[PDB]
């Protein structure tokens, strides 16, 4: 037994962690209305991506890692001599990345692939990667790891706001919002993940109150957990995420782990400007 853990690029792990644990990444891509396209990487400058989004008449589209792209990486990892690969994927509710990971797996002989649907995205998805690597070091077997991650998924979630619903709406990434259309009476939309899909949760009158709602909803859930990791995941409005992070640092006991991350271009292409998420995991995830 030699277990490897990999993921797709939308887990948005820090390059320090990718380098420390030698995490292989199957990248997603984004394409703009002028045909411009690029692979997701920590080498991309996120501020320029938002600038290009803003100066686009048409919202940009994204692509899962082609089914051939995973095969290459398992084959790569096969040829390195690993016997089992745990694969943490973007939510199957919003992306074909998970299925293409599963279908690619069935195609590579000589290694056992265990694809796992995180049912979330960004560093909340990344937390499953970090949990899986920790368990491998602890001597756990692949089925024990998948079982543990499944349990973790029962106590993981996220709420989120965006400036305008158009990107989520036009890209088909929001569910159940066919009535919120029609000049959504100003009132900021608060959304949440449910069973891997993004659904409306509440409509609040201001963006500051949307941020307060993010905090209230998540704190009321995680007060019942034995272990708590919170992630503020910010889009392009710096003060948005700084405010929420500072507030959580003040309001939460130090027994809660409170961390900060950002959206990369694939997720940002569907959120648009002003994205801000607050996610939670009922575990003390190893962030180092
Ligand atoms: C605190 C966590 C916040 C998480 C917010 C995630 C927002 C996801 C928006 C939809 C992204 C869809 C990407 C699909 C990629 C593809 O397969 O083309």
């Amino acid at each position: 037994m030699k277990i490897a853990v990999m993921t797709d690029s939308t887990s948005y792990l820090s390059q320090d962690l990718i380098d420390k644990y030698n995490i292989q990444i199957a990248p997603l891509s984004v394409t703009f209305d002028d045909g411009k396209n690029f692979t997701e990487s920590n080498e991309i400058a996120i501020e320029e991506f938002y600038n290009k989004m803003a100066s686009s008449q048409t919202i940009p589209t994204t692509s899962q890692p082609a089914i051939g792209e995973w095969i290459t990486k398992y084959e790569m990892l096969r040829d390195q001599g690993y016997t089992d690969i745990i694969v943490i994927c973007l939510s199957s509710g919003i992306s074909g990345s998970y299925q293409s990971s599963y279908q690619a797996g069935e195609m590579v002989e000589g290694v056992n692939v265990h694809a796992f649907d995180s049912k979330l995205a960004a560093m909340i998805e990344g937390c499953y990667v970090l949990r899986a690597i920790e368990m491998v070091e602890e001597g756990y077997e692949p089925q024990q790891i998948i079982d543990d991650l499944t349990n973790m998924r029962e106590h993981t979630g996220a709420y989120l706001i965006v400036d305008d619903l158009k990107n989520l709406q036009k890209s088909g990434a929001i569910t159940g919002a066919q009535a919120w259309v029609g000049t959504l009476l100003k009132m900021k939309p608060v959304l949440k993940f449910e069973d891997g899909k993004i659904i409306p949760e509440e409509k609040v009158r201001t963006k500051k109150r949307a941020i307060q709602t993010l905090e209230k909803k998540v704190l009321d859930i995680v007060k019942d957990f034995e272990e708590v990791t919170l992630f503020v995941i910010n889009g392009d409005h710096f003060e948005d995420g700084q405010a929420l992070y500072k507030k959580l640092q003040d309001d939460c006991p130090s027994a809660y782990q409170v961390a900060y991350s950002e959206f990369g271009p694939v997720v940002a292409a569907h959120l648009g400007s002003g994205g801000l998420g607050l996610g939670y995991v009922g575990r003390k995830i190893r962030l180092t």
Side-chain angles (χ1 to χ4, degrees), residues 28 62-64 90 94-97 120-122 124 158-160 168 173 193 198 231 233 263 266-267 270-271 277-279:
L28 283 81
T62 66
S63 323
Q64 48 167 279
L90 191 59
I94 63 184
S95 182
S97 173
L120 233 152
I124 301 300
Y159 291 71
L160 67 146
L168 285 171
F193 266 78
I198 302 179
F231 265 93
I233 307 193
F263 301 111
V266 176
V267 172
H270 297 266
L271 295 183
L278 181 54

Side-chain angles (χ1 to χ4, degrees), residues 217-226 228-278:
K217 296 253 173 232
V218 169
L219 293 186
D220 282 315
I221 291 169
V222 302
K223 68 164 152 41
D224 295 322
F225 295 166
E226 265 152 59
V228 175
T229 299
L230 304 181
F231 265 93
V232 176
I233 307 193
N234 200 20
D236 62 333
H237 297 339
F238 181 67
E239 175 70 32
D240 278 18
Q242 302 285 121
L244 179 54
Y245 181 81
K246 264 62 140 71
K247 195 65 204 323
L248 289 168
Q249 282 202 144
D250 278 21
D251 292 349
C252 294
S254 287
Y256 290 7
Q257 207 165 213
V258 179
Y260 181 90
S261 185
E262 296 196 346
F263 301 111
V266 176
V267 172
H270 297 266
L271 295 183
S273 198
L276 173 67
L278 181 54

Side-chain angles (χ1 to χ4, degrees), residues 132-169 171-182 187 189-202 204 206-226 228-263:
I133 289 171
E134 183 182 34
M135 278 172 87
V136 166
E137 324 195 334
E138 284 174 343
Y140 283 98
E141 309 185 78
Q143 201 42 229
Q144 299 176 299
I145 299 171
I146 292 293
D147 288 359
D148 186 280
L149 304 182
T150 301
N151 171 275
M152 177 183 144
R153 198 171 59 187
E154 299 181 349
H155 312 94
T156 301
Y159 291 71
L160 67 146
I161 66 165
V162 294
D163 276 353
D164 194 53
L165 261 166
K166 155 206 100 197
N167 288 58
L168 285 171
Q169 258 177 180
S171 86
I174 193 152
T175 306
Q178 308 95 315
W180 259 5
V181 297
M187 282 189 93
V190 175
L191 316 169
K192 77 172 201 243
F193 266 78
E194 185 92 75
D195 189 32
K197 302 254 181 213
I198 302 179
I199 66 175
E201 152 86 12
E202 146 155 16
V204 302
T206 86
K207 157 104 168 284
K208 178 161 66 189
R209 256 185 316 171
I211 297 185
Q212 288 162 342
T213 300
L214 273 206
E215 190 192 11
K216 175 74 179 345
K217 296 253 173 232
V218 169
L219 293 186
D220 282 315
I221 291 169
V222 302
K223 68 164 152 41
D224 295 322
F225 295 166
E226 265 152 59
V228 175
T229 299
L230 304 181
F231 265 93
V232 176
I233 307 193
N234 200 20
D236 62 333
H237 297 339
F238 181 67
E239 175 70 32
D240 278 18
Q242 302 285 121
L244 179 54
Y245 181 81
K246 264 62 140 71
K247 195 65 204 323
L248 289 168
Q249 282 202 144
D250 278 21
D251 292 349
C252 294
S254 287
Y256 290 7
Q257 207 165 213
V258 179
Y260 181 90
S261 185
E262 296 196 346
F263 301 111

